[PDB]
């Protein structure tokens, strides 16, 4: 009903002849973080989390850090008349969460706010508080744990719609996990494969994941020479296979 | 909970002030082999085993061979009134698994049975079936795979109790691995180091394992001249450093 183990998804059935509808739960994750909500008050509480080390701790650290940032970005706005729509977008690769507000009257008309939770293109290490480095590190670890939770659920739960589903919507998380770990305290080939091939079907993923190949040395060195991202002055991602895919905005809604 | 990748251990916490409790999983391995249990019905099934070549195949071969041997040793006993205690012992260097049975009444009184799975001191090559050479070769490979599993888990999972834990309980496996590979179809210095220094601490092992030194030539030649084992007519092992440790019986219980 409400409660589900962190990172897991559900597959629902739309009918128009039936098509699958992936409930990835990314919206809900982001929403909780924005509200500063604590782990014990989430749909995620009360499952065994020995597979996800430090989930509750890092989740609450991250929740606070996101909450405070939100407040800083919204203290300079008057939002007493407005309501946050149940739509969150993510722009990449700074993991820029974007909210849209509209007037309680309509539901001056609409207002937008963006917070880059994991800024990657323009950073300061030396001129950054411990609060910020600790908050970021917690956000990233939460994302990693979400993806592990996703993968573990996928592994244990075959479904005949799997062939039609892909890791497409997880991309911004994956890109930020790879980007942050690289550009601030190596590249995890699992994360990098899934970010690169956002068209990875679920059944194929399950069967292949454990035999995934490492980053080719020509790519590793092209990365050290030129970054991971290629700015067009719109950002391109430097894939594990040398592809250069456009990282478009993803939109998430409440399910 | 139940399921764990082959060879891996868990560290639990007793309190009396807390002390670590190593769950090596050796008992469970042996128990399965005795029951002839097949890989697909073990706690070990459903992980990727590309790191452990032929695990399921060799495990099932070995499982059958141990099961049949058990039955041969127990067909000449009446055990309908009795129950196998959850205690298995191993005597070395023939990898002699010892079970103890007691009456369902008590739980004539107790009965003992011993099967040398990998006999090393007194063997026949020419007068031995293919069934036996294939069963033995499978048992030995399973043991080697268990140790590889153990080492891999150790490498990837630091723990602050490591400094207090040692490879002590793995000794009979290690001695039989080295003994069988030598006396029947060279010496692996990793296996030999760990068999010799059954006091190797986990943290030290992890840091040092990859830079382990080869057998000194004076030892290699003392081995070719005199065996590996020294019988006292109680067996002594000829260590990689020239030590001559007594190989005592080890006792394993269900965790």
């Amino acid at each position: 009903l409400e409660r589900r183990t962190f990172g897991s998804y559900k597959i629902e059935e739309l009918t128009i002849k039936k098509i699958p509808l992936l409930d990835d739960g990314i919206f809900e994750l982001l929403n909780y973080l924005i509200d500063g909500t604590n782990f014990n008050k989430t749909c995620y509480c009360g499952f065994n989390y020995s597979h996800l080390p430090n989930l509750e701790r890092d989740f609450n650290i991250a929740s606070l850090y996101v909450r405070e940032n939100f407040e800083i970005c919204t203290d300079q706005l008057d939002l007493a008349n407005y309501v946050r729509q149940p739509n969150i977008s993510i722009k990449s690769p700074d993991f820029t969460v974007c909210l849209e507000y509209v007037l309680k009257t309509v539901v001056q008309e609409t207002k937008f706010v963006e917070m880059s939770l994991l800024p990657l293109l323009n950073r300061e290490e030396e001129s950054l508080t411990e609060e910020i480095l600790e908050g970021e590190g917690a956000v990233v670890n939460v994302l990693k744990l979400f993806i592990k939770g996703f993968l573990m659920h996928l592994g244990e739960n075959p479904n005949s719609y799997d062939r039609q589903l892909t890791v497409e919507k997880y991309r911004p998380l994956l890109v930020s996990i790879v980007g942050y770990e690289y550009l601030v305290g190596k590249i995890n080939h699992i994360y990098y494969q899934l970010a690169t091939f956002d068209n990875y079907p679920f059944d194929l993923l399950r069967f292949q994941l454990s035999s995934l190949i490492s980053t080719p040395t020509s790519i590793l060195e092209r990365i050290t020479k030129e970054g991971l991202f290629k700015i067009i002055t719109t950002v391109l991602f430097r894939g594990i296979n040398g592809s250069e895919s456009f990282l478009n905005i993803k939109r998430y809604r409440r399910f | 909970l139940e399921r764990r990748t082959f060879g891996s251990y868990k560290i639990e916490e007793l309190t009396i002030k807390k002390i670590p409790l190593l769950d090596d999983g050796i008992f469970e391995l042996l128990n399965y082999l005795i029951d002839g249990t097949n890989f697909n019905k073990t706690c070990y099934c459903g992980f990727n085993y590309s790191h452990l070549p032929n695990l399921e195949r060799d495990f099932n071969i070995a499982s059958l061979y141990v099961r049949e041997n058990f039955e041969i040793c127990t067909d000449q006993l009446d055990l309908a009134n009795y129950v196998r205690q959850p205690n298995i012992s191993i005597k070395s260097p023939d990898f002699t698994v010892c079970l103890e049975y007691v009456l369902k009444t008590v739980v004539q009184e107790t009965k003992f049975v011993e099967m040398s799975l990998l006999p090393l001191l007194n063997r026949e090559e020419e007068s031995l079936t293919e069934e036996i050479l294939e069963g033995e070769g499978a048992v030995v490979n399973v043991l080697k795979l268990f140790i590889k599993g153990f080492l891999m888990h150790l490498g990837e999972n630091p723990n602050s109790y490591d400094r207090q834990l040692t490879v002590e309980k793995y000794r009979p496996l290690l001695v039989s691995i080295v003994g069988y590979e030598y006396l029947v179809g060279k010496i692996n210095h990793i296996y030999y180091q760990l068999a010799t220094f059954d006091n190797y601490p986990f943290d030290l092992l992890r840091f040092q394992l990859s830079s382990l030194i080869s057998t000194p030539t004076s030892i290699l030649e003392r081995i070719t001249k005199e065996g590996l084992f020294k019988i006292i007519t109680t067996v002594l092992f000829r260590g990689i450093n020239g030590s001559e440790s007594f190989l005592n019986i080890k006792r394993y219980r269900r965790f």
Partner: peptide, 16 residues
């Protein structure tokens, strides 16, 4: 999909 093989990814090297 009751016949599809399940995989346990709980031990994958995911830097967590």
């Amino acid at each position: 999909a009751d016949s599809v093989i399940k995989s346990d990814f709980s031990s994958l090297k995911l830097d967590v």
